[PDB]
Homo-oligomer: A and B are copies of this chain.
């Protein structure tokens, strides 16, 4: 079976055969599309098929499918699974797995970079302090004094699910958010719950609007521990606007390194529950979502007052005007400070190039339109008019329950 997708702006049509390799379910049926739903301890029984398929993938990619090294590797994994109930990935396999999990992340507009992922193997880590050390080195390497480099650090895989490694932070660098008794929030409202966990775990909060949160790190199933990232490792960019001199006076800054640490990396049936990864920001992630979402810093009002906009009726589009200016300021600040950032125009154009190239060399490119289209100016970016097929390939990054809702507390 072949499936065509059309770009309605360019009439370019592409044929997807890769969706045939898709095993996991999407959430949709013939009768209901769940395309806009955010989200629609594994025994030897189902593990070796997962292992075999990954190794079939891996050896195909190195043009060694069916070789003796391929058969011997299957046999070695087979006996290791039936003996030890799990198995260990070679370093080659882990690196392939990590890059392909990103390559397969259908919601990621940044995937043109997928093959340039720096993989740090932290599977020898055993303690929270050791995790802190690995994470610090990740942040320093990824940050590279503003010339950001994609990287992932992979901590030991789940075994029996009672010994998980977890990074309890949603991102390695995030600002605290404090709920005040009067109902107002200080800092990042997205982070109130995690901030309160940190403070309860002993963190002394500065209680400012841009406090970098501590790392809360869980090794081998033990209770998490608090560590402060050294501030010299945390690259931040003060946000100013190239024409509005009062913008700097809004006191805004953001950190430079987007580093997701709450997802689960699945490779050949193995589950890597702590796998922080980082790339670089698309400008709208800060300018549109982090500052302008009603449930975040929500500076639209203040920026619109300072621009002296007609804020009485929404049909004045003061919101849209303030939104563009905030996003101009974010891009200008990062570029001025020589910190890697990409605007949503450049990123989507690259994604289209990437996606076309993937259809030719790989037979398709799973893409979640709902997530790929930027949250402002959607239809003047070329992905808006691109039809996309969404399906699930492994290796993959998956969501996993927040650790504070599942963790058994030692004391």
Contact = CB atoms under 8 A, between A and B. Distances in A.
Interface of A: 3, 5-6, 8-9, 19, 22-23, 25-38, 283, 288-289, 292-295, 300, 314-317, 319-321, 323-324, 327-328, 331-332, 335, 343, 345-346, 368-370, 373-380, 384-391
Contact of A30 (B25, B36, B38, B345): B25
B29 A26 contact: yes
A165 B317 CA distance: 42
Nearest to A315: B343
Contacts of A346: 314-315
Given A25-B31, A33-B391, 18 more contacts: A9-B293, A22-B31, A22-B32, A26-B29, A26-B32, A29-B30, A35-B36, A35-B390, A292-B379, A300-B380, A314-B345, A315-B345, A317-B324, A317-B331, A319-B377, A321-B324, A323-B380, A377-B377
Given A295-B9, A384-B375, A317 B321 contact: no
A294 to B, nearest CB: 6
Contacts of A386: 36
Contact of A36 (B289, B319, B345, B387): B387
A387 B370 CA distance: 11
5 contacts: A5-B37, A36-B390, A293-B379, A320-B377, A376-B378
A343 B314 contact: yes
B283 A315 contact: yes
A319 B328 CA distance: 11
Given A33-B33, A38-B387, A317-B343, A288 B380 contact: yes
A300 B31 CA distance: 40
A9 B331 CA distance: 25
A33 B38 contact: no
Contacts of A384: 375
- A283, A289, A295, A315, most chain B CB atoms within 10 A: A315
A320 B345 CA distance: 10
Contacts of A321: 324, 328
Nearest to A288: B379
B29 A28 contact: yes
B36 A388 contact: yes
